[PDB]
Design a binder for this molecule. Structure first.
Ligand SMILES: OC[C@H]1O[C@@H](O[C@H]2[C@H](O)[C@@H](O)[C@H](O[C@H]3[C@H](O)[C@@H](O)[C@H](O)O[C@@H]3CO)O[C@@H]2CO)[C@H](O)[C@@H](O)[C@@H]1O
Ligand code: CL
Ligand code: CL
Ligand code: CL
Length: 414
């Protein structure tokens, strides 16, 4: 018996770490688990070819935001039984439980595996040298912009690069997702889509959504984000933070683990950034504190010839011991509420900042058409960033771009 699992690159040697995690299950049940690692950039294509063809693994990792679209294709085995075995709805944060199904589906189709949410990593040495108090900078939008202003003024140079640091690094290349933009939209009192009047419609062009987006993109326009950063993607900016080029950058909890791994092992432990690392939550906007809350679930294809063994592997991967172990190896958070108490999470002060930020986590609605919506939003946001690269983003230019995105999103939501 060989069980097939597809996963994404959740740790530095992702297949080895997954193989170590399931070894006790393999021994107990007399099976080999065969793992395939898919890069995030292609995983959606490969999982959808599997859905449409009926040729694929037993289990796949799914980003939480993908569960609705794959569920709607009718290729996922119901897993209400597995979720009840793991303690049901009470065992999960609502933000996680909502990811277990297509919104308005009668059955669960994904088992929570791990959670992650976004916060700001910052250079403790750089904010000190600029006289920025992080408790002020990360409190409000006003604090944030004043902190970046001090950081632009600062005479600080990285000890390794002997060069200045960008106040804020954020990618300007057309993004794959709204994860970076979402907290700004939400903090202004906006949303990406809104349910009202028996339907979902775009809200990207609401006055609140546009205030949040404009506030965010205009930081770069004011010189707090260098031109070089506008020409990079998320991975490039992450490498730039590691390499000592950025004072502030937003990411998830995994960067804490990577900071304890040597560079030659896929981390940045030797680097000045690893030795001077802080974490602060997203600042409150005018309408409050929000961050993107996501993670990954596991799903079982209903064409699997190994559903019994696969359901036992889902209960194993979703249960307390494996929850702690995998989160320890990846730097993610457990999906199961009870596993957060482990001292490897609670006694880690940077991760404690992420745990506290989870109070303000916000998810996307689990819609069948979510990917279509997010893809039209990011195409138009990429045009917005291209105007920032000219210094020509106006409120009117942004509104016109979000009015076009909204027309297209509304047409897709019909
Ligand atoms: O949009 C799909 C899903 O995204 C999930 O976030 C992942 C990002 O898409 C992915 O780019 C990022 O990759 C990390 C990687 O885990 C890490 O090992 C490497 O060092 O850096 C990469 C970042 O450049 O991982 C995250 C977390 O898995 C969301 O969590 C999910 O909700 C969403 O559907
Ligand atoms: Cl963005
Ligand atoms: Cl939203
Ligand atoms: Cl990207």
């Amino acid at each position: 018996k060989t069980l097939e699992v597809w996963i994404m690159p959740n740790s530095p040697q992702p297949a080895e770490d997954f193989k170590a995690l399931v070894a006790p299950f393999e021994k107990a049940h007399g099976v080999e688990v065969k793992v395939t690692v898919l890069d995030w950039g292609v995983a959606w294509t490969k999982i959808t070819t599997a859905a449409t063809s009926g040729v694929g693994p037993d289990l796949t990792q799914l980003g939480t935001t993908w569960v609705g679209a794959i569920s709607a294709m009718g290729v996922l085995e119901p897993v209400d039984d597995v979720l009840e075995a793991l303690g049901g709805e009470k065992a999960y944060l609502p933000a996680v439980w909502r990811t277990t199904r297509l919104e308005g589906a009668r059955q669960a189709t994904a088992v929570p595996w791990f959670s992650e949410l976004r916060a700001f990593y910052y250079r403790t040495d750089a904010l000190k040298a600029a006289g920025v108090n992080p408790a002020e900078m990360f409190a409000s939008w006003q604090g944030f912009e004043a902190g970046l202003a001090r950081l632009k003024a600062s005479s600080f140079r990285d000890p390794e690069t002997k060069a200045p640091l960008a106040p804020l690094c954020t990618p300007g290349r057309t993004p794959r997702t709204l994860h970076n933009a979402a907290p700004w939209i939400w903090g202004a009192g906006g949303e990406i889509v809104r349910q009202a009047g028996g339907r979902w419609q775009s809200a990207l062009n609401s006055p609140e959504s546009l205030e949040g987006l404009y506030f965010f993109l205009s930081l770069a326009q004011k010189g707090y984000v260098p031109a070089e950063s506008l020409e990079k993607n998320t991975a490039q900016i992450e490498a730039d933070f590691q390499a000592g080029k950025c004072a502030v950058f937003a990411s998830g909890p995994w960067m804490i683990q990577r900071a304890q791994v040597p560079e030659a092992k896929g981390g940045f432990a030797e680097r000045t950034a690893a030795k001077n690392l802080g974490v602060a939550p997203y600042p409150a906007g005018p309408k409050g504190r929000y961050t993107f809350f996501g993670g990954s679930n596991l799903a079982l294809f209903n064409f699997s010839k190994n559903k019994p063994l696969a359901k036992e592997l889902l209960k194993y991967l979703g249960g307390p011991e494996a929850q702690v172990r995998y989160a320890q190896m990846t730097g993610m958070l457990p999906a199961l509420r009870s596993a957060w108490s482990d001292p490897s999470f609670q006694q880690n002060p940077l991760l404690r900042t992420f745990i506290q930020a989870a109070q303000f986590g916000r998810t996307y609605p689990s819609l069948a058409g979510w990917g279509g919506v997010e893809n039209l939003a990011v195409q138009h946001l990429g045009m917005a960033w291209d105007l920032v690269a000219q210094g020509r983003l106006t409120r009117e230019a942004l509104k016109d771009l979000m009015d076009k995105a909204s027309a297209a999103i509304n047409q897709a939501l019909r």
